[PDB]
Structures are given as C-alpha cells and as structure tokens.
Structure 1
Amino acid sequence: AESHRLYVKGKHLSYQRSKRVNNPNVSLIKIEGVATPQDAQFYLGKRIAYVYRASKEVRGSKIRVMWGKVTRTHGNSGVVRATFRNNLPAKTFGASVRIFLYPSNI
C-alpha cells in the first residue's frame, strides 16, 4: 500500500538539562500521539533510530543510523528520556526520529 511505516514518529527536543547545564548523554523525545506518562510507559525500552544522510558512501550506503532506546518517561506530557550508543549531535533538536515496535510485549 501507499503506507509502509512500522515505527512511531518522534521528535528530538533537547538534551536532559537544568536551566544552564545540559547532559548530552540523555535525550528528550516527544513521541507523536503520546500525551501522558501512562501512555509513554508502553514505549519504554523501545528501540529508536535517528536516520540521516551523508554525501560519502561508507558500507554500500549514503544512509547512516544512530541507535538508542527509550529508558523512562519524562515530565507529565508524554515526553520520554532516551539514550543512544553515541549521543545525538544536538543539531537534531527538532529533527525526526523513529521509535520501532520492538522489543514488543504485545
């Protein structure tokens, strides 16, 4: 069909931070269609991919992935905390990430 999506759309908002100090090791992700920590609990442990393009082919591709996972809920409005094997670049504040349905408990 015209749709092939098997992931949930997400947006990289910022690092974990206080007013004036940020923590690049933890990222804050807004998952589309999630408005409460109760709903965000379904996504805990789900794998996250940041998919970007580069001019240089490396291993047969110009597409590169940064892999991570949802670790806990954040705040009251369905935002979650996520950790990646390498921290997100921080120019991706506002960029789109993919939250897959694996590992699945349903």
Structure 2
Amino acid sequence: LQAVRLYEKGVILGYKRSQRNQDPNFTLISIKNVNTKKHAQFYVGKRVAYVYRTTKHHDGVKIKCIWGKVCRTHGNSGVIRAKFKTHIPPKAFGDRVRILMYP
C-alpha cells in the first residue's frame, strides 16, 4: 500500500571481534537474503541507516538515524562489516538496519 521500502533489511550482530577482544570501529551486519561472500560483495559501498526511536523529542522528532556504510564482506556466509559515523551502541545488537539502495 503506502510507505515503499526500497531497502534491504539487516540485523546488527556484534562488533568486529575476536574471542575476548572487540574492535568497535566496525559492526558485523547480517543482510536478509544473502548467505554467500559473493552475494554480500554486491552491497559493498551502500549506505546503512540504523534508525531508532527515542524516549523524548530532539528536533520535534522521536526518531534518529546513525549513518554508516558497508565496507567489505566478513567471512564466507554473507555477513558484512559496516563503518558508522559513530560506534553503534551495544544495546542495538540484534536491532534492524536498512541497507539502502543508494549510492
């Protein structure tokens, strides 16, 4: 009906990480229908929006977005690394991101 989406859904997994060590400059993101490195390479360079709600208004709006970008793939199973303007908080692990169709 209304509110076209034209973006691919993704989920914020943890940070770029080893066992017992974190690199919260990158975020691991899982994209909806991608399960392979070759397919994940497709959405490289696309902008990513972490859109989330907030208890009280900040510009007359209850919603704000953390902007980032897909930088490269991660592993073999279509997980990507995203670099955001600011490190997304670990409270957002498991939340939804938009892999936008632009650029």
Q: Match for residue 102 of structure 1?
A: 102
The alpha-carbon deviation at position 4 of structure 1 amounts to: 1.5
Moved beyond 6 Å, runs of 4+: none
**1:94 positional shift:** 0.8
Which residue pairs with 1:71 in the alignment? Answer: 71
Task: Tell me how far 1:3 sits from its aligned partner.
Answer: 6.1
Other structure's SS at 2:92 match = coil
Tell me the alpha carbon deviations over residues 30-77 of structure 1, each in whole angstroms, 9 at most, x when there is no partner.
000001111011100100011111122111211010000000000000
The number of residues matched between the two structures is 103
Q: TM-score, normalised by structure 1?
A: 0.93
| Paired residue type of 2:82 | A
Query: What are the residue-to-residue correspondences of 1:21-40 with 2, within 5 Å?
Result: 21-40=21-40
Match of 1:8? Answer: 8
* Unpaired segments ≥5 residues, structure 2: none
CA distance in 2, matches of 1:45, 1:87: 18
CA RMSD of aligned residues (A): 1.0
Percent identity between the two aligned chains: 55
For residue 93 of structure 1, report the CA deviation from its aligned partner: 1.1
